[PDB]
Amino acid sequence: ERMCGRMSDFCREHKTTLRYIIWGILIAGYLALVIAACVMNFHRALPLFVITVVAIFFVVWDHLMAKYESQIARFLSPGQRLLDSHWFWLKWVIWGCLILGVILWLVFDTAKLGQQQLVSFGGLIIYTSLTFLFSKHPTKVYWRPVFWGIGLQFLLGLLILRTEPGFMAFDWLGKQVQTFLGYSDAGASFVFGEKYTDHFFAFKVLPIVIFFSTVMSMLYYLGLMQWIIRKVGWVMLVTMGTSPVESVVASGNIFIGQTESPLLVRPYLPYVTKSELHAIMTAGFSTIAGSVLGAYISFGVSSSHLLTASVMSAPAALAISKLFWPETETPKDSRNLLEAATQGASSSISLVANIAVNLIAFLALLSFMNSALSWLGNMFDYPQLSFEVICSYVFMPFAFMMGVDWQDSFMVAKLIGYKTFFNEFVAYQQLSKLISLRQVGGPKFVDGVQQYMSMRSEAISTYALCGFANFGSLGIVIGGLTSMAPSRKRDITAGAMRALIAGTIACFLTACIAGMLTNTP
């Protein structure tokens, strides 16, 4: 094999140039594919052209910023110095302008809609105050994230509710995510037989976790996910104090489940601070997944309201995490692709078992609590006593503060009780039943039991229920997070209940703002 050795030496002589040539050949082939697709039919080939243009623009921008960083920094430094010099009096001007804008908005927009929106605004203020009062570290609170989150959720709500173009983009993104999950559905269909839909959770919801684990492992190996995390971290750090990890988690949870989303930042989980872990859990508890979203738009719940609530939850989750548990402490392996995929698979084999077992145990305990309450009520002539009715009676003032008129406070409180102590699936079933009763028509009160509730109360209830804040969710979150990062086990269980409460309050805040904006048609 003298010839083989000579050829190997020759290739090694021009190894870099050979690699550059082959990569250039592949790039030329991809560009030829794009150009041919455009030639045959441009409208048909438009998405591939747009994707290619965005990718090439990002590559060029990154290279240019890396090369010309010195000149850009030197040019920008004087502006930063000037801003630092004049901040002392400029902060007052900015705050005054913002207060003036809020006053104008209340005067011209909300006052015209009706009196019920001012109550929504009052509720918003009350909720913020209460969250600050019971915060873990009241003194060490950073108010910039909170105000930015409230303002951002307000703007996004106004961008999705008032304008159709804003609606279209988020609809498109949701469709893409659901289409993505359909693939794990197909794999599970093969492995568990065609009758896998008989056992929905066990044979459908967990294969999603397996597939997402696999893909995320591969994407961390390739290096795209770290680029995404860097870009998101930078933009969010300029716009808010939020750190990159929790910002990315919160953005991901908009369309991804609570159990899947922490896999976005799995490598960083051991080294996150307590506040960032609390923010991760809270962001998980205050959003719903994609498949459930499809099933809820199927039941008859409005699609626009579900989408608006899902999008608005993330800023609200971040603001409530930063207020409820501020950050006092200072922050802070795959040889090839097949290794990435296989390691993802194995991590999944651990995760799924832990999740399932914890969920079983927690639901059993909750049912026992409810049955002991029913027994105690039976001894008092009121066997109907349970968690749901205690919430139907306790939650009425909060429901009224959210904006729903007094008459409909009871039904909204009961729905929130079902949602908190039973998955929001049953809560949305009840809500759709009430919507159907209203649409069919009939007497408002049969004898003394109300049948349905106004349209506006239905919208508020739709906003309030959009979240995975239950105790089964508590179980699956604890199990999954302890499987992902065993080192932080003692820390994960510490902030679980506060995370759950923060998630529920985030849902209530989104509902408060939505009621501030929406009006009965």
Query: Which residues ranging from 414 to 453 are in contact with its own copies (CB under 8 A)?
Result: 421
| Single residue of 160, 316, 359, 431 touching its own copies by CB under 8 A | 359
Can you state the percent helix, strand and coil of the chain, rounding each to 5? Answer: 80, 0, 20
The answer to the question of residue 296 lying near ligand XMO (CB under 6 A) is no
CA atoms within 13 A on the CB side of 83: 5
Q: How far apart are CA 407 and CA 400, in angstroms?
A: 9
Q: Which does 151 bind (CB under 5 to 8 A by kind): ligand LBN, its own copies, ligand XMO, none?
A: ligand LBN
For residue 149, the minimal CB distance to its own copies (Å) is 23
Q: Which does 289 bind (CB under 5 to 8 A by kind): its own copies, ligand LBN, ligand XMO, none?
A: ligand XMO
Is residue 281 within 8 Å of residue 477, measured between CB atoms?
Answer: yes
Nearest to ligand LBN of 152, 225 (CB atom): 152
| Single residue of 158, 295, 297, 369 touching ligand XMO by CB under 6 A | 295
The answer to the question of residue 411 lying near ligand XMO (CB under 6 A) is no
Q: Which does 447 bind (CB under 5 to 8 A by kind): its own copies, ligand LBN, ligand XMO, none?
A: none
| Single residue of 137, 144, 230, 489 touching ligand LBN by CB under 6 A | 144
Name the token pair of 462.
Answer: 């739709």
> Could you tell me where the DSSP H helices lie in 255-336?
274-285, 290-299, 303-324
Residue type, 157: G
Burial 403-418 (b: 16+ CB within 10 A, else e): bbbeebbbbbbbbbbb
Q: Give the N- to C-terminal CA distance of the chain in Å, as an integer.
A: 84
Q: How far apart are CA 372 and CA 417, in angstroms?
A: 18
Q: What are phi and psi of 442, to 5 degrees?
A: 135, -170
Is residue 180 within 8 Å of residue 215, measured between CB atoms?
Answer: no
- Using the rule CB under 8 A, give the single segment among 146-154, 191-199, 236-244, 505-513 that binds its own copies: 191-199
Element (H, E) at 510: helix 496-517
For residue 97, the minimal CB distance to its own copies (Å) is 27
Nearest to ligand LBN of 6, 144 (CB atom): 144
For residue 223, the minimal CB distance to ligand XMO (Å) is 21
* 484: Cβ contacts below 8 Å, ≥ 6 apart: 262, 263, 266, 269, 347, 351
Which residues pair with residue 445 across a beta bridge?
Answer: 450
Q: How far apart are CA 248 and CA 236, in angstroms?
A: 9
For residue 111, the minimal CB distance to ligand LBN (Å) is 21
Name the token pair of 143.
Answer: 């108010």
Is residue 361 within 8 Å of residue 474, measured between CB atoms?
Answer: no
For residue 336, the minimal CB distance to ligand XMO (Å) is 16
The answer to the question of residue 183 lying near ligand XMO (CB under 6 A) is no
- Using the rule CB under 6 A, give the single segment among 65-73, 143-151, 157-165, 463-471 that binds ligand LBN: 143-151
Nearest to its own copies of 80, 176 (CB atom): 176
The answer to the question of residue 148 lying near ligand LBN (CB under 6 A) is yes
Instruction: Tally Cβ neighbours within 10 Å of residue 498.
Output: 18
Binders of its own copies in range 28-67 (CB under 8 A): 33, 36-37, 40-41, 44-45, 48
The answer to the question of residue 155 lying near ligand LBN (CB under 6 A) is yes
Q: How far apart are CA 354 and CA 348, in angstroms?
A: 10
Q: Which does 11 bind (CB under 5 to 8 A by kind): its own copies, ligand XMO, ligand LBN, none?
A: none
Binders of ligand LBN in range 90-129 (CB under 6 A): 94, 98
The answer to the question of residue 500 lying near ligand LBN (CB under 6 A) is no
The answer to the question of residue 427 lying near ligand XMO (CB under 6 A) is no
The answer to the question of residue 292 lying near ligand XMO (CB under 6 A) is yes
The answer to the question of residue 129 lying near its own copies (CB under 8 A) is no
506: nearest Cα among 318, 244, 275: 318
C-alpha distances in angstroms, 241 versus 148, 254, 262, 285, 351?
9, 20, 20, 21, 32
Burial 5-39 (b: 16+ CB within 10 A, else e): eeeeeeeeeeeeeeeeeeeeeeeeeeeeebeebbe
Q: How far apart are CA 401 and CA 116, in angstroms?
A: 10
C-alpha distances in angstroms, 200 versus 192, 195, 196, 424, 463?
11, 10, 7, 16, 26
The answer to the question of residue 219 lying near its own copies (CB under 8 A) is no
| Single residue of 257, 326, 344, 403 touching ligand XMO by CB under 6 A | 257
Q: Which does 147 bind (CB under 5 to 8 A by kind): ligand XMO, ligand LBN, its own copies, none?
A: ligand LBN
| Single residue of 146, 205, 319, 404 touching ligand XMO by CB under 6 A | 205
204: nearest Cα among 182, 177, 178, 185: 185
The answer to the question of residue 468 lying near ligand LBN (CB under 6 A) is no
The answer to the question of residue 416 lying near ligand XMO (CB under 6 A) is no
The answer to the question of residue 175 lying near ligand LBN (CB under 6 A) is no
- Using the rule CB under 8 A, give the single segment among 121-129, 391-399, 407-415, 490-498 that binds its own copies: 490-498
The answer to the question of residue 12 lying near its own copies (CB under 8 A) is no
Please report, as ranges, the residues that interact with ligand XMO according to CB under 6 A: 200-201, 205, 209, 212, 257-259, 289, 291-292, 295, 355, 423-425, 468, 470, 472-473, 476
Please report, as ranges, the residues that interact with ligand LBN according to CB under 6 A: 94, 98, 144, 147-148, 151-152, 155
